[PDB]
Amino acid sequence: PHEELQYLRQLREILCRGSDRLTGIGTLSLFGMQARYSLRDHFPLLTTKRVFWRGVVQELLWFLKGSTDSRELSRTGVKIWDKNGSREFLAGRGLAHRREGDLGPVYGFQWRHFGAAYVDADADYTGQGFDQLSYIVDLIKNNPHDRRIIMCAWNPADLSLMALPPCHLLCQFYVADGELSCQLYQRSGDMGLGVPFNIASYSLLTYMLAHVTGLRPGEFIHTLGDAHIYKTHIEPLRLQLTRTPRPFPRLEILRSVSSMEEFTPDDFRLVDYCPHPTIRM
Amino acid sequence: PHEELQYLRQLREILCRGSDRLDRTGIGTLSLFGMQARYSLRDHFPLLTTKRVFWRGVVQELLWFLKGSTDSRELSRTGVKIWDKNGSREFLAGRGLAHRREGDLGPVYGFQWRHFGAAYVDADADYTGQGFDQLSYIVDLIKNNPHDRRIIMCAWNPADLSLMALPPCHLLCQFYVADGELSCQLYQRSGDMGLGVPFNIASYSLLTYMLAHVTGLRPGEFIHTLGDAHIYKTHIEPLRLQLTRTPRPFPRLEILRSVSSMEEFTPDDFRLVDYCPHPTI
Ligand SMILES: Cc1nc(=O)c2cc(CN(C)c3ccc(C(=O)N[C@@H](CCC(=O)O)C(=O)O)s3)ccc2[nH]1
Ligand SMILES: Cc1nc(=O)c2cc(CN(C)c3ccc(C(=O)N[C@@H](CCC(=O)O)C(=O)O)s3)ccc2[nH]1
Ligand SMILES: O=c1ccn([C@H]2C[C@H](O)[C@@H](COP(=O)(O)O)O2)c(=O)[nH]1
Ligand SMILES: O=c1ccn([C@H]2C[C@H](O)[C@@H](COP(=O)(O)O)O2)c(=O)[nH]1
């Protein structure tokens, strides 16, 4: 039974039993969902519609950098954070005095410098705040059965400095039988666009962490809070609800990388990815 | 089907195929990673019946949390001693926390809920207007923007971990409103299925009843998401016994008078009817 059917059943449920609720734009939604994806023999990149894999990779490395600069992601060809880094959008957020591309203390800053005072995207933060990436990497290496291997992006005190508050709040990691697993808690999930993307991101993070630590990829567990469908997306989502999953691709890591920071997009080969055609939403 | 059978199934799964691990202090647990159970709050209250749950503790401890107290001496005064061991002068010394008055647990749940991001100095100090008051934040959201997808309270603060007596188990809870009902999901990084988890279920269910009462809504669903779900090997025998017990119907919870603020609840506003658990083990 294909694991992608979990995602497809969740879609089907939200569309059929979801709550119909409206500030700006309207959605169908359910609350509390969990799905499991094996990482042992394949990589759970959804096949019912093509997922922007190039975006997935560039954005994770950009996160892992600690960068909060939407321009630096943009330079690589990935424009998904650009609407949010415009001086116009920032102004609308009451953050007008930002330079272009300064998103505030978003994921990268929270992952590498939690609790630090944010100044701007160009400030040097070395040795400031709590480095969560170094923290979990050390625990996975030297104390793998620890129950506190967590990386959290939710920092309520920093919300008003943020262009957009984080959706995927925290990940926890788990080690058993030489396998590295990961649970992601996502407060909010757009099933039409974000959620396939998000599944891929944290699955990737786990492959990367597994590699760097000498472990094999295990399970990725996806726990949603608000799982929702935007109503404008209903006829394209019914389209994808008709399609049968193709087998998952595999993910190869093309070289020895000793540090989470030394990865490059060319270290990853996506083998045998054959999605159905892209659906625009 | 009776909801407690979710918990008991989880017990059995862990006992049957759980992973046999040791910590770096040598103690053995069986554990599994990634679990979710749903408990209805509408017609009843999910206080577990196959073993008696310390309900007096549940109530006093939560009221204690909601006040922002990080003083174990205060909870202990009520006759509830569950945090006394962690508050002892010797425990804190064992943690490497000198200059600590007895009962000073550090920036734990209460401090995080009320003053997230604030500079902790001590349990007696006064933090008014320091940090981010998450409790007011969520009560406000549930009242004035119930469909917000960021109705979050979080206790995981990486920067404060070395200052805490114990690191938080309940990382965060999220709330959700639909069709006149308040719902809640909790992310728990670590659950002792033997002692902690029944208690923990009662705690956040109770919190949801209180929030529902204060905001003019009916208790909806409580979703319980776990990370490391485990059983200490020493308790396997009493748990075998527990698993033979047939669950009895859940009690109910009546809130006596009208309470207008989350801070004005007293242990007396709560009527538990009728809790008839199998004998304690
Ligand atoms: C309403 C909303 N839903 C989302 O899913 C969402 C996601 C992000 C960030 N994110 C995690 C994204 C992942 C993928 C994206 C995207 O734009 N994909 C395009 C592909 C672009 C292209 O043509 O190359 C798409 O397929 O529409 S955006 C930001 C705001 C959002 N807003
Ligand atoms: C290893 C471990 N497991 C736990 O479950 C745990 C729980 C807490 C805090 N906690 C969340 C607790 C919930 C319930 C508790 C308890 O001891 N209840 C007693 C009541 C004692 C009495 O009635 O006098 C009991 O149920 O027997 S303690 C602290 C450390 C822990 N440590
Ligand atoms: O990584 C992401 C980022 C955003 N979103 C979606 C979820 C919501 O539909 C919207 C964010 O809006 P709020 O939930 O923050 O209001 O974008 C995702 O699914 N994944
Ligand atoms: O509210 C609580 C507090 C603690 N624990 C348990 C979980 C673990 O067995 C232990 C905490 O140890 P660590 O997870 O921190 O190692 O206590 C709970 O189940 N619930």
Numbering used by the authors:
A (entry chain B): 51 to 72, 75 to 333
B (entry chain A): 51 to 331
Verbatim from the authors:
The ternary kTS structure were determined by soaking apo kTS crystals with dUMP and raltitrexed since co-crystallization of kTS protein with ligands was unsuccessful. For the ternary kTS structure, an excellent density map of the ligands was observed except for the glutamate tail of raltitrexed. The ternary complex of kTS had an open conformation in which the catalytic Cys219 residue did not form a covalent bond with dUMP, which was also observed in rTS. In addition, the sulfhydryl group of ternary kTS was 3.3 Å away from the C6 atom of dUMP. The raltitrexed molecule was observed to bind to kTS at the active site by interactions with Phe104, Ile132, Asp242, Gly246, Phe249, Tyr282, and dUMP. There were less hydrophobic interactions with raltitrexed in kTS than in hTS. The Trp109 residue in hTS was found to interact with C7, C9, and CP1 of the raltitrexed molecule; the corresponding Trp133 residue in kTS did not interact with raltitrexed and was rotated about 60° away from raltitrexed. The distance between the Cα atoms of Tyr282 and Ile132 which were located at ligand binding site of kTS ternary complex was 18.8 Å, whereas the corresponding distance was 17.8 Å in hTS. C-terminal disorder might contribute to the open conformation in ternary kTS and rTS. Although the C-terminal region did not make crystal contacts with other symmetry-related molecules, we could not exclude the possibility that ternary kTS structure was not able to adopt a closed conformation due to the crystal lattice which may impede conformational changes to a closed conformation.
